[PDB]
């Protein structure tokens, strides 16, 4: 009768917007046409992570297991452990906590043990400097993802430590109209339980493809020895384009698998980064939901951010429809005057939210 939703599409965003806005939510028909219908194990463990990180939020599930009614409590945050199930790595759990985090009572010092990263989901270094600098631009100061034990795709056993300790009152409003002049193209390549020459065969191919450019290329290498190597061999590569003059970033990452040649994987992440940096304006396409949720929980004023005509696709449409059903904020889409690059300026008036859990 109050807030109804269909399907497990953008489900993490539905639950994180319910607990930020403080409105009760109800989502039914979580893949109801299926032989194994209802809530999967990773999202049930995600909901009990939410219950561990909040207080007073009650969660009830139907006997079908496809209907979830959620009252929200207050975001206490704090320090706790959380084993994550092997169906889904730590990125899928940490990336909604990364914008639920900075408003709580205590500091966020929460450690995730399990699979580090996989293909469809976010890597740890990927979120580290593809999403902590955009958080630093939106207003937080002290945030870190202490990677203190890497894991692996099929067995995992890795340990990350999300710690944010800048309890901001509210995110400051954002003003980005210029396409950022990309100064540096950096990246890292990580390897676990393999030969170290796999890293060089990644990096020489990737910077061979990107070496025809005037930009300063700098990719670093890390192997993980000892018990920081996880429990299965695996290796990945991530690259960011860092614009230092205002501090923006774009990024692309991938992890190899059985038969993945390091040269062609470096070529694939290099071309994927060029796809993202040609397709995206002023913010990463994967950085976009965090960007619009901080702009919509900004101060009671308008904040404006440039995106291009490529950025508007079905994920962005279901994002804006989600926020328009949760706290009914129309996003105004101005066009930029120079039509050589068909860019929209999204202006969003932030709902006047403050964090209401601070001992003062």
């Amino acid at each position: 009768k109050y807030t109804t939703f269909q399907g497990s599409q953008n489900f993490r965003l539905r639950i994180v917007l319910a607990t930020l806005s403080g409105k009760p939510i109800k989502i039914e028909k979580i893949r109801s046409g299926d032989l194994n219908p209802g809530l999967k194990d990773y999202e049930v463990s995600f909901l009990r992570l939410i219950e561990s990180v909040t207080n007073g939020s009650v969660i009830e599930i139907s006997y079908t297991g496809t209907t979830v009614i959620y009252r929200p409590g207050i975001i206490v945050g704090g320090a706790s452990t959380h084993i994550c199930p092997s169906s889904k790595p730590v990125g899928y759990f940490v990336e909604p906590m990364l914008y639920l985090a900075p408003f709580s009572k205590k500091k966020f010092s929460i450690l995730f043990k399990g699979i580090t990263a996989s293909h469809n989901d976010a890597g740890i270094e990927a979120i580290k400097w593809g999403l902590m600098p955009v958080m630093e631009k939106f207003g937080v100061r002290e945030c870190a993802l202490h990677t203190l034990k890497r894991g692996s795709p099929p067995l995992g056993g890795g340990e990350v430590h999300l710690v944010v300790d800048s309890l901001i009152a509210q995110p400051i409003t954002m003003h980005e109209i210029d396409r950022p002049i990309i100064s540096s193209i950096t990246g890292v390549a990580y390897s676990t339980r393999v030969s170290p020459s796999l890293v060089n065969r990644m990096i020489d191919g990737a910077k061979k493809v990107l070496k025809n450019l005037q930009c300063e290329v700098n990719i670093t290498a890390d192997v993980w020895r000892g018990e920081n190597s996880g429990k299965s061999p695996g290796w990945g590569i991530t690259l960011v384009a860092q614009s230092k003059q205002k501090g923006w970033s774009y990024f692309a990452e991938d992890i190899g698998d059985a038969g993945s040649i390091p040269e062609e994987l470096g070529e694939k992440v290099a071309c994927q980064l060029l796809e993202e940096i040609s397709k995206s304006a002023a913010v990463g396409r994967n950085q976009l939901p965090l960007a619009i949720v901080y702009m919509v929980i900004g101060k009671e004023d308008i904040g404006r951010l440039r995106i291009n005509k490529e950025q508007i696709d079905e994920r962005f449409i279901i994002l804006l429809r989600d926020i328009k059903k949760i706290f009914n904020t129309e996003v105004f889409l101005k066009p930029v005057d120079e039509a050589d690059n068909e860019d929209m300026i999204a202006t969003i008036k932030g709902i006047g939210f403050t964090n209401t859990s601070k001992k003062i």
């Binding site: 002049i181 005037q214 694939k268 940096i277 040609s278 396409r285 994967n286 308008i302 889409l333």
Partner: protein, 72 residues
């Protein structure tokens, strides 16, 4: 146009974008690896992108209110 195209309830998102012209999977979209590698064998299309305190605070908030009104 595109604002009422988004906020109209009836149409699907892909029908909206094809009239104009699943997010648990975090990863951004991508084309064929060989296709965009062959397209970007030369990458000079992206060369256009590549290359006192109280009166300070009052000026900050008043310029915020002024740009708020000027796009209102």
């Amino acid at each position: 146009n595109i604002g009422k195209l988004i906020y109209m309830d009836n149409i699907s998102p892909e029908e909206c974008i094809r009239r104009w012209r699943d997010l648990e999977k975090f990863v951004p979209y991508f084309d064929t690896f060989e296709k965009l590698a062959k397209k970007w064998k030369s990458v000079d299309a992206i060369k256009e992108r590549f290359l006192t305190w109280y009166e300070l605070q009052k000026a900050k908030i008043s310029k915020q209110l002024e740009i708020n009104n000027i796009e209102y």
